[PDB]
From a paper:
Furthermore, the reconstructed OB fold could also be converted to the four-stranded SH3 fold by a simple circular permutation.
Furthermore, we verified that the 13 a.a. sequence forming the flexible β-turn in segment 1 in the OB-fold designs could be shortened to 7 a.a. Taken together, very short In/Del and a few point mutations are the determinants in the transition between the DZBB and OB folds.
Residue numbers in the entry:
A (entry chain A), B (entry chain A): 1 to 49
Amino acid sequence: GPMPGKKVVARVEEILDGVARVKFEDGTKKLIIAPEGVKVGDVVEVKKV
Amino acid sequence: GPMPGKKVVARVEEILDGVARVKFEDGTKKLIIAPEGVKVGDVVEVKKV
């Protein structure tokens, strides 16, 4: 079961026009939309609104 | 170019064991890791750490 209070983060491997290819904790790489100011090598979080 | 100060959010369509299928603003649906407490119908954000 997902751990309560655990933040979810991914590493930015490639980015173009606000769309980042990120590596998740399990090592899987996927495209996501990322905010402006995010560069390759930066870390992003997935958080509940 | 990505708009500066614009938050990135996605809608949670399906979730299981901390892995959500979310719909991005463009309508594309993808699996992501999501924090504990995220249920179907919730909204998540992608934010720089």
